[PDB]
């Protein structure tokens, strides 16, 4: 429910340890929990705002010079001087002109020339920093419910929206008859602020980085400032023309908003239109399940004759949804659904959505659940006119577990060391494996950076060489950890 | 003294008339009217579909987005034959003459 | 070449290769830009709509 | 508890430009969409909307391109529509309509649900 | 432009009626979003059943649907004299664009 049909989705069983469990969660996926007990969720971000901005630094794209004055003097006579060099709107330069009786001053030599004109931007871009307080992630839960219509519905009143914040608490949702459900989220691990800049075009906006921000070779101008016409690095944005030795002109230099389209290459674009809405990064939750009513306990079982009245369809990783309706009386009540076999006595193929109610009227509900990897029946009621409808999920062998380890891998590529808080307290493995891939993680990060695409493919060949040729058994410390992995991280990146 | 152009780029342009066009999983790739106009810039991606999409089957239907391309600024390019080139050049004396 | 209003003297190899969406020169009204792939970016976020 | 409501203008000479209104209530009007449905007097309902949202954006409706303009506003929680040279044919009534937006605010796949609750119509008329 | 329900069906008050729209796989045939509407010749519709088979709540448990390919069907089990009205469609394209039913009403006498 919501969560059935969109991508790279997830799922954690498991609320081992006490009754939590760790699940950290970005913008396109969404996690399912399953328990023992403890009836399944659907979470996922929706929306991530900034809420209050203040502006670091702003440039300037597009500008414009009028207001040219020129002074050139005479050889071996000190050097020009022009009353609107005394300002600093205008750029000047002093350069070399040759002189000599034609031009009306004697000595025939290399004289002094300045040209002042006169700074004027049209076309701003600015980028405003924001403190990791003060900015308000929301996240929605949706049960499965098995409510009529309501699958793959990202959009409909359904669930819950809460709207997290580190000045926020707990923030317990109580979802209606399923009981409440608290969230112990870290909302400042995460996206890691105070080096984004939330930069901004004309109608677009990025999430760029602050030192990346900072040594732009654009004229520039600190934030805070009315009167915006103080630029400071005016001299990368004209072009000082001394063609031969005669005098010389300013020209300006064009746009550089298409130039910076393209240094916006690998920056991650954001919403920066009516309120700084961000769609990027995860959110580490710490999600504890122990006052979770089940909905669907202390009612009867059925009598029988259902109707599927939406054909059974598979999803991705394998999970069928159907749609039955009850016929009869008692409209209140449990759901006979059990997946088995061929010969019919072993019950295997679990469910994802347990325990299946018919909510008390003619309204039919969504059931999902997960078959084996060969033929299997799926059976729908009891013995007077029950349904055994047949189904087939195709592979599946060892191929779905060499599967999830990719995946797996892949989560390890783009989430950090956060990729060890997706499950609950290992202990012994997990909570060593966190240090151990901060440590190579954290030397790893103090090296690869700036590195491209293709740059750290070169240096996994080079360093899978050198093991490929060394001796006294580095042939594994430098094939396995570096040679190797420093492949696949050039492989898996530039998302 | 005559050139022609030979090949005109442009510099700054706009987008107008967006359209879309999507399709369910397993039924193939999409088609506009817009996309063998040659004034339309057109692409072939696919977005994952579901029953909460009215579509059924649970998987990546395909989808075109199409946006006329408009050129405003232009950079031309003037060409010359090696004939029609006119240069100048001038003769001058030292004559002992003032200025 | 020539700009709004300024004008270089670069050589055809390099100018015939230049990735920017361009036109047969002597025509009139355009319709017909080529590699306009070049000056047009398409964005598909989340594997949601582009 | 959730009402659409417009306002009715009758008498219009064809030429002008005519406008109608819709005073949303009951719901948070920045995340839901808004639609237009025109019925000819007798005959079938025809689709003239123009799919509003937070931002402002809009569906071209190729038979009611370039003749019929629409209008958001955000504070008075309102949506206008703005049909300019209508004719005699261009009389009709006129039927706003309620769609629910994606959770990122680009409204491009509707809900299942479409339509859920309209407003009372409003008949105008040319001489 | 449009779908094409016929121009008026009847009945006697207890029996079912099938009304159906046909239409091309833009909008039909491949999608779910075949909505259907009812008008009493007072003022404005109400929806009154959603994609192929699903109803709001407050629609009165035997209004029907199916689609059988490029045509959706409107059954209404049980009929009585209420329900003489203006029955229309509605549905999503593959454009992007909703088109609408031709115009199907009921009488019950």
């Known amino acids: 429910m919501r969560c059935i049909g969109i991508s790279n989705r997830d799922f954690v069983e498991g609320v081992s340890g006490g009754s939590w469990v760790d699940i950290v969660l970005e913008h396109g996926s969404c996690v399912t929990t399953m328990a023992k007990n403890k009836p399944t969720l659907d979470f996922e971000l929706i929306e991530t705002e900034a809420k209050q901005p203040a502006t670091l630094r702003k440039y300037c794209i597009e500008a414009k010079l009028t207001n040219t004055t020129t002074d050139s003097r005479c050889p071996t006579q000190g050097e020009p001087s022009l009353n609107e060099e005394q300002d600093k709107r205008f750029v000047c330069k002093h350069s070399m002109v040759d002189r000599g009786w034609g031009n009306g001053c004697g000595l025939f030599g290399k004289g002094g020339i300045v040209t002042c004109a006169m700074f004027t931007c049209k076309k701003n871009m600015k980028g405003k920093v924001v403190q990791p307080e003060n900015l308000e992630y929301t996240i929605v839960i949706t049960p499965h419910s098995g409510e009529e219509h309501a699958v793959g519905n990202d959009t409909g009143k359904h669930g819950k929206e809460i709207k997290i914040t580190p000045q926020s608490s707990i923030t317990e949702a109580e979802l209606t008859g399923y009981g409440t459900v608290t969230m112990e989220c870290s909302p400042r691990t995460g996206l890691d602020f105070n080096e984004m800049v939330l930069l901004q075009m004309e109608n677009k906006a990025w999430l760029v980085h602050r030192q990346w921000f900072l040594d732009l070779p654009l004229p520039w101008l600190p934030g805070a400032d009315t009167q915006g016409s103080n630029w400071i690095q005016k001299e990368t944005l004209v072009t000082f023309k001394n063609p031969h030795a005669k005098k010389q002109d300013v020209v300006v230099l064009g746009s550089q908003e298409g130039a910076m389209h393209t240094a916006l290459t690998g920056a991650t674009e954001i919403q920066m239109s009516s309120g700084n809405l961000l769609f990027t990064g995860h959110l580490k939750c710490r999600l504890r399940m122990d006052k979770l009513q089940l909905k669907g306990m202390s009612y009867s079982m059925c009598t029988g004759k259902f109707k599927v009245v939406k054909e059974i369809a598979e999803t991705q990783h394998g999970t069928i949804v159907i749609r039955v309706q009850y016929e009869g009386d008692g409209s209140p009540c449990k759901i006979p659904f059990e997946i088995m076999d061929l010969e019919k006595r072993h019950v295997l193929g679990r469910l994802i959505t347990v325990n299946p109610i018919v909510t008390e009227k003619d309204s039919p509900v969504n059931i999902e659940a997960e078959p084996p990897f060969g033929d299997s029946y799926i059976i729908i009621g009891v013995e007077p006119g029950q349904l055994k409808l047949n189904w087939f999920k195709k592979g599946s062998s060892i191929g779905q577990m060499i599967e999830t380890t990719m995946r797996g891998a892949k989560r390890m590529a783009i989430l950090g060391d956060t990729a060890w808080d997706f499950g609950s307290l290992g202990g012994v493995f997990t909570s060593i494996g966190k240090a151990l891939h901060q440590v190579f993680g954290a030397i790893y990060g103090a090296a690869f950076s700036g590195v491209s695409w293709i740059m750290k493919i070169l240096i996994g060949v080079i360093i899978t060489w050198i093991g490929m040729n060394s001796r006294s058994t580095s042939l594994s410390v430098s094939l396995v950890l570096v040679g190797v992995v420093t492949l696949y991280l050039g492989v898996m990146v530039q998302a | 003294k005559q050139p022609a152009t030979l090949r005109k780029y442009c510099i700054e342009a706009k987008l107008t008339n967006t359209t879309t066009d999507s399709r369910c999983p397993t039924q193939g790739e999409p088609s506009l009217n817009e996309e063998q106009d040659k004034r339309f810039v057109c692409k072939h991606s696919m977005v994952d579909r579901g029953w909460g999409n009215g579509c059924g089957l649970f998987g990546k239907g395909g989808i075109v987005t199409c946006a006329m391309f408009t050129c405003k600024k232009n950079m031309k390019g003037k060409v010359v034959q090696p004939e029609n080139l006119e240069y100048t050049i001038v003769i001058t004396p030292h004559s002992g003459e003032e200025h | 070449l020539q700009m709004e209003n300024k004008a270089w003297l670069v050589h055809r190899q390099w100018f015939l290769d230049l990735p920017l969406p361009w036109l047969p020169g002597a025509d009139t009204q355009g319709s017909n830009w080529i590699q306009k792939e070049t000056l047009v970016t398409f964005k598909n976020p989340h594997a949601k709509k582009q | 508890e959730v009402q659409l409501v417009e306002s009715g203008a009758e008498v219009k000479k064809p030429g002008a430009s005519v406008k109608v209104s819709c005073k949303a209530s009951?719901?948070?009007?920045?995340?839901?969409?808004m639609h237009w449905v025109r019925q000819a007097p007798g005959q079938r309902l025809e689709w003239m909307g123009w799919?509003?949202?937070?931002?402002?954006?809009?569906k071209y409706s190729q038979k009611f391109q370039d003749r019929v303009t629409i209008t958001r506003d955000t504070s008075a929680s309102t949506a206008y529509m703005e049909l300019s040279s209508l004719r005699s044919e261009d009389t009709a009534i006129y039927y706003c309509?309620?769609?629910?937006?994606?959770?990122?605010?680009?409204?491009?796949?509707?809900?299942?649900?479409?339509?859920?609750?309209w407003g009372q119509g409003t008949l105008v008329t040319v001489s | 432009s449009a779908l094409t329900q016929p121009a008026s069906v009847s009945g006697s008050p207890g029996q079912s009626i099938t009304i159906s729209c046909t239409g091309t796989?833009?909008?039909?045939?491949?999608?779910?979003?075949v909505s259907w509407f009812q008008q009493h010749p007072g003022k404005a519709p109400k929806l009154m059943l959603y994609?192929?088979?699903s109803r709001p709540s407050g629609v009165s448990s035997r209004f029907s649907g199916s689609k059988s390919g490029n045509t959706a069907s409107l059954t209404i089990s049980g009929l009585q004299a209420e329900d003489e009205a203006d029955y229309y469609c509605s549905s999503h394209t593959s454009r992007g664009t909703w088109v609408f039913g031709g115009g199907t009403k009921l009488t019950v006498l």
């Open positions: 994609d192929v088979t």
């Open positions: 799919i509003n949202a937070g931002n402002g954006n809009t």
């Open positions: 309509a309620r769609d629910k937006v994606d959770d990122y605010g680009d409204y491009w796949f509707p809900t299942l649900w479409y339509f859920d609750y």
């Open positions: 796989s833009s909008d039909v045939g491949g999608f779910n979003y």
């Open positions: 009951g719901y948070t009007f920045t995340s839901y969409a």
